[PDB]
Amino acid sequence: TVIVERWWKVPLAGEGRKPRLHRRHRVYKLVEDTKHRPKDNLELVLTQSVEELGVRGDLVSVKKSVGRNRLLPQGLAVYASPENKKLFEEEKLLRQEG
Amino acid sequence: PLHKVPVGLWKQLRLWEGIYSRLPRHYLRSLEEARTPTPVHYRPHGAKFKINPKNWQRERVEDVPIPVHYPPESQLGLWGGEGWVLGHRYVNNDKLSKRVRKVWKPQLFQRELYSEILDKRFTVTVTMRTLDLIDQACGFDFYILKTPKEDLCSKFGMDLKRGMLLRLARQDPQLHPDDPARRAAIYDRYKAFVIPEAEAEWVGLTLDEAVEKQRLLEEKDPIPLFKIFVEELLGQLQQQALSE
Amino acid sequence: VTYFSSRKGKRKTVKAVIYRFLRLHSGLWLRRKAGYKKKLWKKTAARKRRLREFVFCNKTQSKLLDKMTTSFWKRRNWYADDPYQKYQDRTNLKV
Amino acid sequence: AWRRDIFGRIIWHKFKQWPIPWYLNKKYNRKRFFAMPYVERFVRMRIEKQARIKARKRSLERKKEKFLQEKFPHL
Amino acid sequence: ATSVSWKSRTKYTVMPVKMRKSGGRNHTGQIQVHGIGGGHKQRYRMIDFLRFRPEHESKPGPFEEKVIAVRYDPCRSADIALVAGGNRKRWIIATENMKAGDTVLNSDHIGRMAVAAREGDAHPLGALPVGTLINNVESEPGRGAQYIRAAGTCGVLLRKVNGTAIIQLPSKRQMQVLETCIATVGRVSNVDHNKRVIGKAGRNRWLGKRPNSGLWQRKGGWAGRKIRPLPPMKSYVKLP
Amino acid sequence: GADRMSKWTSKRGPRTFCKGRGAKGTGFHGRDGKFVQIKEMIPELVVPELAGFKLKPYVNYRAPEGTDTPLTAKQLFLETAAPAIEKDFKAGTFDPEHLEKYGFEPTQEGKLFQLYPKNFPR
RNA sequence: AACUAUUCCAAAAGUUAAACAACUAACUUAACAUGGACUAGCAAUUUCGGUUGGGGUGACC
RNA sequence: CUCGCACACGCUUACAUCAGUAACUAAUAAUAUACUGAUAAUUAACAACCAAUAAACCAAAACAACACUAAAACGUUUAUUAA
RNA sequence: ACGAGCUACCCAUGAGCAGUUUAAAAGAACCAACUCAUCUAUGUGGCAAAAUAGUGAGAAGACUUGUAGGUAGAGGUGAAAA
RNA sequence: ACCAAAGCUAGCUCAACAUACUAAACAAAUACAAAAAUACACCAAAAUAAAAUAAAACAUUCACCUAACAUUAAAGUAUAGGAGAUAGAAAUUUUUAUCCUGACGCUAUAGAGAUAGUACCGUAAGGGAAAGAUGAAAGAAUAAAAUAAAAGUAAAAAAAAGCAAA
Ligand SMILES: [Mg+2]
Ligand SMILES: [Mg+2]
Ligand SMILES: [Mg+2]
Ligand SMILES: [Mg+2]
Ligand SMILES: [Mg+2]
Ligand SMILES: [Mg+2]
Ligand SMILES: [Mg+2]
Ligand SMILES: [Mg+2]
Ligand SMILES: [Mg+2]
Ligand SMILES: [Mg+2]
Ligand SMILES: [Mg+2]
Ligand SMILES: [Mg+2]
Ligand SMILES: [Mg+2]
Ligand SMILES: [Mg+2]
Ligand SMILES: [Mg+2]
Ligand SMILES: [Mg+2]
Ligand SMILES: [Mg+2]
Ligand SMILES: [Mg+2]
Ligand SMILES: [Mg+2]
Ligand SMILES: [Mg+2]
Ligand SMILES: [Mg+2]
Ligand SMILES: [Mg+2]
Ligand SMILES: [Mg+2]
Ligand SMILES: [Mg+2]
Ligand SMILES: [Mg+2]
Ligand SMILES: [Mg+2]
Ligand SMILES: [Mg+2]
Ligand SMILES: [Mg+2]
Ligand SMILES: [Mg+2]
Ligand SMILES: [Mg+2]
Ligand SMILES: [Mg+2]
Ligand SMILES: [Mg+2]
Ligand SMILES: [Mg+2]
Ligand SMILES: [Mg+2]
Ligand SMILES: [Mg+2]
Ligand SMILES: [Mg+2]
Ligand SMILES: [Mg+2]
Ligand SMILES: [Mg+2]
Ligand SMILES: [Mg+2]
Ligand SMILES: [Mg+2]
Ligand SMILES: [Mg+2]
Ligand SMILES: [Mg+2]
């Protein structure tokens, strides 16, 4: 994704009127390319035991490639979501029991 | 001479007459309001007011969306509400250099995605932004249900949504025929988005498709005048019999 | 100069004037000398002073600048603390 | 059926007898009942032209009255 | 507008089929290739370039065919031969001494002892001696012959290493192939095609060549005598 | 500059252009290339015997015209189905399910001359 | 500039060891194909200061 | 004195019969294939329109015996259905 | 936007080339039809917005020619004469 | 005395209102080579307006320029600009119904191109005309009535010598 900015300042229309655009408002400078940002990590909760990463019922951080294209399709992991998280809160409380 | 009503309003008053009048109100109210799509390519400044750096004064400030072009092949996939940016640039970024037409195209990928509710793997062209939004909303089906019409931008997204919205309002047994366990389990997590049935089949519809549908529901072969005349005659005969 | 604007149909001002001159209310215009910041090491003390002055424009220039400038810039201003308020009126002018 | 042809006019389309159903018919299938986007402009022009004609037919009649009223002021 | 290529005929026929020349024009109608058009009218003979082609899938074994006639072909430089076996005939590209009333073997079979090579014989490369002359060379096995079909051309098998053959193309470039690929043994027909003398501009027109342009172009940097080290060896062997 | 205005007719073009004047086809092209007529496509005129009947192309002048009433679906209903329906409702034998005895036809596809798709010329 | 080819970095898909020494990196790339660069081709936009015993050359400003 | 008759393409009644031509067309008259009016007319045997799918056929047109090179337009039969 | 019914070059599909000379249908020879357009004189608001009269060049070929189709202006086509 | 001259109508123009906005006419035929009743398919699509011009040249720039938001002001102000030519807001303000619709608009070289998108000119897209005048009655044409005034001619050729007159 390219994040782009205008070279010429657009005037204001404040009442809820739409801005009055001229052709010179189509000249953009390129402020960012999202694809070039240092990339983040994905946080997951494992539903089985993965070889390197860890145990069933574990919170791990991987790179989005491994997470999107291996774990999530194979049902080897689920997202970090709160509703999905409380399931393993309960599982953690009923594991250490017996 | 002059038109009595401005031509900006000819599209609107086109919808107040004829078959468009007989469309269900919730649909027309879903089309009426255009919510401002989430900023994708341009990056918005938060504040309404901003202090002018040169001037040292409080200055009113607005956000103006950057026109983005969606090629028709974007309607077959899900690009994450983004598209082609058509515009110009200065070379070297010196304002004094040549000014040149430039188009910024999204990077597209072939990825197969799994829908739980529809129980299927679609091969879809998506962007990295789409994958990040799916990640952020924690499910494919979530992402499709959880996002407004303006933010998906795809007709295919709206048809996915119409489909699984229908599957939720119906509680369709054919989802997982063998295991009602899985079925209830799945229908469970999505219970927040459940909407009635009359609403659910009109969600993803183009004005064309809508008009067509409504035309088909109204489809009737004109009633023979023999019927109508027979009913008038029975009315008259039953009021001639009851008067004596 | 634009005599009739497009949107408003009014008469625009040429800002390039507003930046380098100053109009007193009497109709006198005031300007800096040219090249007063330029190459100072090469110049006499006397000449430097002659440059540092604020000076008045002749009639022709005054009419020109007036034409290049709208009515707003000719209004009577009262500024707090203003250096030039002293100079806005004319006195003892027998003509 | 009421249809909309290439020219954006709203036309009454009479049907025709065929031995085969419509989706298997080459010749019929290459007709177009619908207008493209450019046609819209012309449609507008049509309206306007029409409106003008009506507009100055009316003004004519009105005028014919005034004249007559000063020619035969029996009122 | 749009023109349709003449090149659609689904079933193979030994009979000459009619073709439409298009002088240099693509399907859009513009000139793509300059200097082409209006030769003599030509029919086209379909050539089977897969030399090993079992008639029925029932009996897979190496089979033998008789050469009926050797005819001139307008479409290519080499002379072609009409070859019949079982119930079927096909045109194949004739080797130099192939004559009518002849016998030609087609075989996919390898063996430890190689083979004594006749002319029309087609064998897998692995089965030939290491100095042999070959033509109509496959690239991948089962693909059909592409390389070395022109008149009087011959390649040569260079060596055999690691279940693979390395051969020398007529351009003196080396080419590496699986040894399971078929090739025909010998030099292609009509060896004197090189020494033919077109007598007059007219003959060139008969061959469907339009004259060069008249514009004068100053020679550029590209021209001169460039002496380039012979290119590295092409390999169609796909490593695991 | 050729001719724009005059209509396009078989007389105008090359040999290859034959456009009928609008008579209707009586047949198809057969095996021999010869043309085959289909006896069913050729309109058969149905002509009554006029000899023993008295009416003439013109009407006597002292003969009166009449008040002009265009026939309406209603009047036709009342001259036909109304006496029968009234007779059978007064006797209580009326059956809203099957009106077929009164002359109503549920669907047209059975009978020879159908009204709505209009099977017959005249 | 675009376009057409080149080369490279990033994107995208991957793959390896559990790395080495003593008491994370590296490598891979089938066709598409994105963003930013490089080298060329093919090109795009625009211009021909004045004086001068006519202009030009020379000279001058 | 010698560009004739027909067909294709094109033109579209300018053709035919009777009548009229003061003026209109003819680069001028006489009068009329060309101006005007009225009334008629080219009749199918020629021409257009006028089957598909499989299968056997390597073998020029040239008075075609047989050949030349530049390698060549043009169909039979068999089967399956063809109102 | 519209134009390849002229013309440039193609694609399909038809058609012409008699006499004479030669073992020869050989981009040979003589010379018609046919195609060109050399030289001169006419003509110059002309018969003609490029013709007439004579005279010439080719005339089984890189030939002439009918019909239908193609390539479109930042282009096409070009035996380069912009 | 010829050629001629004179009409006052046809209609138009600009606004107002207004419902609401593709007129009229459809029997057949119309997207085969439109107007040709009748046979197994295909069907369809989008990419920023540009430049002339202004800057006394031209290279960034150049209002309006087929995208509804009007009006009184703020204001040609803040701002934006080879900081040049020029471009240019907003916050914030103001706006009382409906009827009184017409004309110091044209009158046939005008007003619509219009008697007509016709004739005609273009292969096509396309271009695109000119033209009317009797009276209550012409079912009052041995016809009756009011200009006889443009250039051009005729009635009536010219007679030494000259910007043609004074
Ligand atoms: Mg060839
Ligand atoms: Mg050959
Ligand atoms: Mg050459
Ligand atoms: Mg050369
Ligand atoms: Mg015409
Ligand atoms: Mg015809
Ligand atoms: Mg004809
Ligand atoms: Mg017959
Ligand atoms: Mg420019
Ligand atoms: Mg100069
Ligand atoms: Mg000069
Ligand atoms: Mg000089
Ligand atoms: Mg001089
Ligand atoms: Mg000099
Ligand atoms: Mg004519
Ligand atoms: Mg006649
Ligand atoms: Mg005459
Ligand atoms: Mg042509
Ligand atoms: Mg001869
Ligand atoms: Mg010769
Ligand atoms: Mg001559
Ligand atoms: Mg002579
Ligand atoms: Mg001659
Ligand atoms: Mg000669
Ligand atoms: Mg000669
Ligand atoms: Mg054509
Ligand atoms: Mg140019
Ligand atoms: Mg060119
Ligand atoms: Mg040529
Ligand atoms: Mg030259
Ligand atoms: Mg030159
Ligand atoms: Mg300029
Ligand atoms: Mg100027
Ligand atoms: Mg200039
Ligand atoms: Mg502009
Ligand atoms: Mg700046
Ligand atoms: Mg300047
Ligand atoms: Mg405001
Ligand atoms: Mg007029
Ligand atoms: Mg006019
Ligand atoms: Mg006079
Ligand atoms: Mg005198």
Give the three-class secondary structure for A33.
strand
Half-sphere exposure of B139 (CA within 13 A, CB side): 17
Backbone φ and ψ of D15, nearest 5°: -90, 175
Distance CA B13, CA B104 (A): 37
| Amino acid found at C59 | K
**Residue found by looking up tokens 């996919």 in the block:** E108
Using only C-alpha atoms, chain B has a radius of gyration, in whole angstroms, of 27
Residue E143: count of CB within 10 angstroms of its CB: 13
**The two three-digit tokens of residue D23, written as one number:** 């989706």
- Give me the residue spans of the domains in chain B: 1-244
Residue B26: count of CB within 10 angstroms of its CB: 13
Nearest to B64 among A10, A29, A64 (CB): A10
Per DSSP, helices labelled H in E112-233 are 201-206
Residues B230, F86: C-beta atoms closer than 8 Å: no
**Is any Cβ of chain B less than 8 angstroms from the Cβ of D51?**
yes
Distance CA E56, CA D31 (A): 50
| Amino acid found at B176 | H
- The answer to whether the C-beta of A30 is closer than 7 A to strand G is yes
Q: Which residues have their alpha-adjacent CB atom under 5 A from ion ligand 8?
A: F 35
- Give me the residue spans of the domains in chain E: 1-107, 108-188
Determine the distance separating the centroid of ligand 17 and the alpha carbon of F1, expressed in angstroms. 30
Residue E196: count of CB within 10 angstroms of its CB: 11
Per DSSP, helices labelled H in chain E are 201-206
CATH architecture of E108-188: Roll (2.30)
Contact assessment for residue B176 and residue B182, using Cβ atoms and an 8 Å cutoff: yes
Distance CA B71, CA B82 (A): 11
Of all nucleotides in the shown strands, which has a C1' nearest the CA of A69? Answer: G13
Residues A7, B95: C-beta atoms closer than 8 Å: yes
**The two three-digit tokens of residue B146, written as one number:** 């959880």
Distance CA A77, CA A79 (A): 7
Of all nucleotides in the shown strands, which has a C1' nearest the CA of C12? Answer: J76
Q: What angle do CA D7, D12, D14 make, to 5 degrees?
A: 115
Half-sphere exposure of E184 (CA within 13 A, CB side): 29
Task: Give the DSSP per-residue string, C11-28.
Answer: ----HHHHHHEEE-TTS-
Determine the distance separating the centroid of ligand 2 and the alpha carbon of E106, expressed in angstroms. 25
Residues B1, D51: C-beta atoms closer than 8 Å: yes
Residue F10: count of CB within 10 angstroms of its CB: 10
Nearest to F99 among B225, B226, B237 (CB): B226
Half-sphere exposure of A46 (CA within 13 A, CB side): 17
Nearest to B233 among F73, F82, F104 (CB): F82
Distances, alpha carbon F50 to alpha carbons B118, F44, F54, in Å:
77, 18, 8
Shortest CA gap D72–chain B (Å): 32
Burial (CB < 10 A; 0-12, 13-18, 19+), residue D68, is exposed
Residues A27, B40: C-beta atoms closer than 8 Å: no
**Residue found by looking up tokens 């500059």 in the block:** F1
Alpha-carbon dihedral of residues C51, C56, C58, C62, nearest 10 degrees? 120
**Residue found by looking up tokens 């800002």 in the block:** C15
Which window residues (3-42, chain F) lie with Cβ within 7 Å of strand H? 3, 6, 11-18, 28-31, 33, 35, 38
Half-sphere exposure of E84 (CA within 13 A, CB side): 10
Closest chain B residue to A18 measured between Cα atoms?
B64
Distance CA E236, CA F28 (A): 61
**The two three-digit tokens of residue A12, written as one number:** 């204001």
Q: How, if at all, do strands A41-46 and A77-79 pair?
A: antiparallel
* E runs forming strands in chain E: 17-18, 43-44, 63-71, 80-85, 88-93, 102-106, 122-124, 133-135, 155-160, 164-168, 174-178, 182-185, 234-235
Q: In this complex, which protein residues place their C-beta within 7 A of any atom belonging to strand I?
A: E 1, 3, 18, 20-25, 28-31, 34, 37-38, 41, 199-203, 205-206, 208, 210-216; F 2
Chain B residue set in contact with F, beta carbons under 8 Å: 224-226, 229-230, 233-234, 237
Distance CA D35, CA F37 (A): 42
**The two three-digit tokens of residue C45, written as one number:** 């003390």
Nearest to B90 among A4, A27, A79 (CB): A27
Distance CA C94, CA C28 (A): 16
CA neighbor of C78 nearest in space, from C31, C30, C25: C25
- The answer to whether the C-beta of A49 is closer than 7 A to strand G is no
**Is any Cβ of chain B less than 8 angstroms from the Cβ of F86?**
yes
Burial (CB < 10 A; 0-12, 13-18, 19+), residue C16, is exposed
Distance CA E146, CA E234 (A): 15
- Positions on chain G within 7 A of a protein C-beta: 1-2, 10-14, 18, 33-36
Distance CA A85, CA A81 (A): 6
Task: Give the DSSP per-residue string, E38-95.
Answer: --S--EE--B---S---SSSS--S-EEEEEEEEE--SSSSS-EEEEEETTEEEEEEPB
**Residue found by looking up tokens 């491994």 in the block:** A66
Of how many residues is chain A composed?
98
Within 8 A of B226 by CB-CB distance, chain F residues are: 77, 81, 99, 104
Rounded to a whole number of angstroms, the distance between the first and last alpha carbons of chain E is: 47
**The two three-digit tokens of residue B177, written as one number:** 């025929």
Half-sphere exposure of B113 (CA within 13 A, CB side): 23
CA neighbor of A78 nearest in space, from A94, A58, A52: A58
Q: Cα dihedral sign for B23, B24, B29, B30?
A: negative
Residue E124 (CA) to nucleotide H36 (C1'), in angstroms, measures 96
Beta-carbon contacts of B27 under 8 Å, excluding residues fewer than 6 positions away, are B202, B205, B210
Q: What angle do CA E129, E134, E135 make, to 5 degrees?
A: 160
**DSSP H or E stretch at residue E233:** none
Burial (CB < 10 A; 0-12, 13-18, 19+), residue F94, is middle
Residue A82: count of CB within 10 angstroms of its CB: 9
Q: Which ligand is nearest to the CA of F19?
A: 6
**The two three-digit tokens of residue C34, written as one number:** 């040219």
Distance CA C50, CA A74 (A): 87
Distances, alpha carbon C87 to alpha carbons C19, C22, C25, C95, in Å:
20, 12, 9, 19
Determine the distance separating the centroid of ligand 10 and the alpha carbon of F50, expressed in angstroms. 108
> Which chains have 3 or more CB–CB distances shorter than 8 Å to chain F?
B
Distance CA B14, CA A50 (A): 60
Per DSSP, helices labelled H in B171-224 are 180-189, 197-200, 207-217
Residue B3 (CA) to nucleotide J100 (C1'), in angstroms, measures 24
Residue C30: count of CB within 10 angstroms of its CB: 14
Residue ranges of the annotated binding site of E for Mg(2+) are 72-73, 76
> E1-107 maps to which CATH number?
2.40.50.140
Distance CA E186, CA E102 (A): 15
**The two three-digit tokens of residue D24, written as one number:** 């298997």
Contact assessment for residue E173 and residue E229, using Cβ atoms and an 8 Å cutoff: no
Determine the distance separating the centroid of ligand 27 and the alpha carbon of E31, expressed in angstroms. 24
Q: How, if at all, do strands E164-168 and A58-63 pair?
A: unpaired
D and B in touch (3+ CB pairs within 8 angstroms):
yes
Q: Which residues pair with E185 in a beta bridge?
A: E134
Distance CA A11, CA B64 (A): 10
Alpha-carbon dihedral of residues C33, C35, C40, C42, nearest 10 degrees? -110
Q: Cα dihedral sign for D23, D24, D27, D28?
A: negative
Q: What angle do CA B131, B132, B136 make, to 5 degrees?
A: 120
Contact assessment for residue E175 and residue E168, using Cβ atoms and an 8 Å cutoff: yes
Q: Count of CB contacts below 8 A, B vs D?
A: 5
**DSSP H or E stretch at residue B83:** none
Backbone φ and ψ of D38, nearest 5°: -60, -35
